Symmetry: D3
């Protein structure tokens, strides 16, 4: 009904309905699973889809797989080509969200994987952008602590990490908030439940540094480049404290799926300059012109699909 015509699985583009499996097949594998979120952005005027920083996502997926210790099976170039092929084959001409997901198949046990082989699918579906809309969310700080390198490295884009995200997002929802921010075990600001967080204070952009215990977000990376290069902003990656964020002029989440999400308040402290505030607005607009292929300066970040 509302399923794509195809997916990619284990080196092959296949009709959706051929990837039928048993209920009991993938539960143990899910504990090993790592994934990527990738957007294809549809430029109607050009009649072209641009995949955003596809190679960087493919590379991070390879790194995640490596950190899980999955044997080599899929190259970066194969992941990139498979993605292009799948988006083309699906023949949906609109904004999409693409999820490669890799998993090890080994022991029918959760505790220990043993002898394993590596498998992977890529799943592409329509997904709206909101880059043309001005909106914002109310955030709280969670009473649950972010995973850290001691227990579950946040660098690894593992499915299991999201159980931690879920503790926080479920608490935000029952406590009257749209979204939750995490503190790390040391009590410093880490990231959102599915994205990284930026603060604007006195004309400066401030974001937790990578060793704060966060995923090395590609949207985050993009934003830092755009802030420095297009807007000439000072950007500090540093340790960030909870109460300083209460006083931010502006704040936003960023991630592939969430794009640039302005934050109106944090623990009910309202960002002084609104949401999206002036600087967030500029970053959001620049980002949108980049990802839709309307900004020649950042062409190398885009992979045209050819449809």
């Amino acid at each position: 009904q509302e399923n794509p015509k195809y997916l990619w699985w284990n080196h092959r583009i296949i009709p959706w309905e051929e990837a039928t499996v048993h209920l009991t097949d993938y539960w143990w594998a899910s504990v090993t699973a790592v994934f990527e979120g990738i957007r294809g952005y549809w430029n109607n005027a050009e009649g072209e889809m641009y995949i955003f920083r596809l190679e960087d996502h493919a590379r991070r997926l390879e790194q995640s797989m490596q950190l899980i210790r999955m044997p080599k099976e899929f190259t970066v170039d194969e992941i990139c080509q498979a993605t292009i092929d799948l988006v083309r084959a699906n023949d949906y001409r609109g904004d999409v969200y693409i999820m490669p997901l890799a998993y090890a198949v080994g022991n029918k046990a959760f505790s220990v994987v043993g002898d394993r082989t590596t498998e992977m699918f890529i799943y592409s579906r329509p997904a709206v952008s909101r880059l043309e809309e001005d909106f914002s969310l109310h955030a709280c700080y969670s009473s649950w602590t972010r995973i850290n390198e001691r227990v579950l490295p946040p660098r690894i884009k593992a499915l299991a990490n999201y159980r931690n995200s879920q503790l926080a997002s479920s608490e935000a929802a029952m406590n009257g908030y749209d979204t939750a921010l995490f503190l790390n075990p040391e009590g410093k600001v880490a990231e959102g439940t599915g994205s990284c967080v930026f603060f604007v204070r006195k004309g400066k952009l401030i974001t937790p540094d990578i060793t704060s215990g966060i995923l090395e977000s590609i949207t985050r990376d993009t934003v830092i480049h755009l802030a420095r290069e297009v807007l000439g902003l000072e950007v500090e990656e540093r340790v960030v404290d909870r109460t300083e964020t209460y006083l931010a002029d502006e704040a936003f989440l960023c991630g592939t799926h969430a794009e640039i999400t302005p934050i109106a308040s944090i623990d009910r402290h309202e960002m002084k300059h609104g949401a999206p505030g002036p600087i967030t607005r500029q970053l959001r607009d620049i980002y949108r012109e980049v990802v839709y292929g309307r900004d020649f300066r950042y062409r190398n970040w885009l992979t045209p699909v050819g449809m």
Copy 2:
């Protein structure tokens, strides 16, 4: 090949009918919780006994509650479904039974919100080693056990096993059979799929539950057996790493692992062997209990009526 049946969402179904799409359950797996339950086949009686079925069903309900899955399955239904399934499968041998509950809602990891609760029960043959004398060499992992700050170990969640996997994968590449965890404070927690006991000078010593461990039912059984049958002094307390190096004996216990003797820890050999005298007594008593040959603990057994 495969069992004849599964139980799924209130009904016993033929194995072959439980087909699904490859992409169906990856997000759900982040919410998933499970139980391990053994059925033990007593050939002389021609009967299967399920060990502490109601205790497992209750812990499953607690896990689901702690995930905030809406009510859907009662403890009594879980118990009856399990009995029905083991009988229907008509396999006359040691089995391992896995009830596994999951919430279905958003095809997103970061947040589920208004979702429904689903569950299958999967019973498969699984050998016992209770008649074999064997032992494993353990290391302490360089990875830290999850704690209540980040991922409560009380909840039998699939996601927790990503942490188990860091440690067990390190044990395997470093020449050990099995890994033990320290908690963030540096105290002894549990094994990657089981709890741990130490014997020193006639006394049984095991990390207390607030050490950051699952409230193991085999652990609970062992404490009852040690106190009531053998009159051993049993301490649940904070346990230090180096004291375990000097244990006379040590063992893992868990539903799947049964009673697993440990020969050495970080290459320090338990001086009374593995299984040492006390482990041997406990292993034998446990075996006579679970196979239904010890009337003192019959209340822990659910006969399936395979006759």
Copy 3:
């Protein structure tokens, strides 16, 4: 409006004469320690009973010692001053009595040098809810409880309540009646103004004192009553957050809060209600004790002679 008297620096003084300058006590407040004590009015007897007066006076002495206030007011004086004040005020009803001690020293916050010790006792009408069945919804705070490293919770210092205020303010704006704290290690400590108990499978469980909590006198009372009157097993131990989500019942206790049932924690509902069976028994036993109708514990009571 106001009580007829208070007690201040060794003397009962008419309310209106205890006037001071705006700038007198701000620095002093950083050193200040206090107690909460209830007087319970038994109408049938026409008598007021002060609950565990001497124990509170002793804890006040300990707090003052831990602040290093020079000796000035003995336990005996605190007890007598309290009795005298409640009698002089001639209010025949449930009261809440607050002795508050402070060092007078440097007009600086950072440091006091040589200091003298001062104290007032302030008694005011305060209703009991021990005849009412009610309960609160609690959350765990995202703010951490003070610990011995930074601000020993053993000391009943005013400054500690700035930490309480972070949590109770968050509970209020997030839709809850009351907040529970985790300590820095992530274990269950206490409420913002009281200690917490959980009932599970017929057993009473409460964070041990080294969890980083005040040594509550209501807590101590409850442990005695649970063991002695109901024959319950009571465990003082490390308590984990998720185990409390599964408690059959839960309650706060403290002098002001009395026995306050908890209906839910982080929206996990206590399965046996609020007050559940065991809480109800403890609340009722406590009420019969403090109003002087249980002679087994009469030695905890100081009759005022009203």
Copy 4:
């Protein structure tokens, strides 16, 4: 004895009329936040200059916001009130000015509900030591500095000083003039009432703000002066305890403390003395600034019109 006036809740009031009841402000004190601001009297000019008045008024606004006090007094009002008070007091000498804001709410410590915001400003004579060469011996405290988990040090709250008091009281009884804090992770934070700087090999080093310190305005001033006037490299970073034992020079800075040289830390003597060469230069530059004799930084000064 006493200033002729203070400012309170929108009005200048004669000193003697600001009388209150003993029991009025104890609960309020737990919510209280304050600022320290100096007025420096330039005798030659016959003028008082208030140092970075607007920055202090803004930090006070921030503290009040972090306590969640409803808006009542704007930055502009705080600045004008300060000017008016110093003028009205007509004291022609170095002063120390303390605005103190507090919420008036529940007569309880644990929790305030709906509250209103109040504030007084209290100006008093206070000597400068910027013309004197002196130094202090410091120890590291065995008590740990508050952190964002429990009591954010960013908030200039009275309650924070209970933590300061643990350390300064220990320094005093153990033979030292002043105490430095480690944060919970064991890194150098700040003094009990000021920030700390170290000089090593011609470089200035100071704990970064996320070390768990107040965002000191004297600290900010010093960083500007070191970089702009002396062309020194200044590093804000994590600082370790033992590296400070090897500093060539060290000093405290804060509004009240001004620039206070440190002779030794845990009896390790700063090798270049106290004030060492660089501290001496910074102290002198700071003095010329605050007394209005350095026109490069005149925008930091508010002339009172005395």
Copy 5:
């Protein structure tokens, strides 16, 4: 001049002057070194020396050596006999303090030992007892933190541990105190710089439990036995807080060398019942009658030397 006639070294009693070595011989070995402190107590009336809990000390030394991973070389019985032989040979008839010290000889490097053999000497010298004197010390809590199992297990009686002790004792001395007490990394009471600590409050004896991060003191063990068995005191081994110790009725250090050392104050808070307070006094007296061989109930703790 003032040196014993003999020591024991590597299986042999030797004249003192034969154990000459090069300045550069033992510096790397010292990093590996572990030791024991043992008292011989001279009962003049009997003309006998009694060594206190010699076998327990020998066993702990073997454990320390094991935890350092020194190859087996010296048995418990040899250590005990060597000690007896040496005390006899030295022919000093008075209170002595005996230090066995074991070390690995391997790499001329500190970082890493490599291939190693195990060596050991025993060094016995006159040492006064003060068990007939009433005296006390003023203690402070150190600003330096006690070593823990994460970094340097306090269970192991290693020379290196005392560098940590030295930070605290040096600070006590320069700050006007006799002696320092430690907090562990979690901020809880651990032990003294060379002994364990006990508090008396409301007729009860309270001491940090072993997993507080302390050496498992044999004097501590003795005291707990004596308090329970002779005095019928309630003794709690538990987590202990700093401020509760400020309010103790009494307090004391105990260790082999320090015997029972009363503490008059802690951070200048004076113990309410003096030093030695009533209970400390009773324990000190009972201890003295035991170690000098005047209490038949505890004869098994004593090894008579035969002189």
Copy 6:
């Protein structure tokens, strides 16, 4: 066999004269601090160069100060003594020189109080491997590095190596050449006898000094060489464990270890080899510097006058 001389307490003495008693220095070793210094023999010039002698002498003085040893030896004396000794020994080859200072006072570990300061300097042949291409396999230890709370890593104290030994002994029994430490917060600190560098995408990354590491002089050298000769971007910062798994190259550096390439970490292979391109450049530049063949860094060298 042995060098002809040592330096001890202000004088050069014949090796054979520095005899002592077995029992003399065990307590002193707890206070002891040392330096490692290399002399490099340039055969073409027939000269020995001491590398950064004054920097080492200064760090020795700082260590001694931090131990609170009374003043006794000046930096200038240490430097001259070293030169004198290397010359007197008349060995024409690569040497490793160890000045080692210790306080002598009480024959007790727990406390020294009013003691005197002593020092020897010990120069011995030691091969360089700067002309060999080799690499080591590293693991992260399950033991935590000492920190400023317990045992400041800044101080080059013998006692700190007990902590090194836990990790290096674990590496050896677990099949690795060398161990890396995490600090108590779980961040990358240093090797057991050296500092560590990572190369990722052209950038050199090394833990900052407040990570809890010795302020390595080889580390300092490397940062100067990388920036000034090669124009590499060098970050001193907090470093995470899993980021190091993905380093293109990695190496240890220390006086004794020189520049030691790391082939893999926890069996993750550095993808550019060992020595990788950048390590190779740094190793070669370092070699040309220390042997006196690079005039740009001549100021770091002290010629001994062996000619």
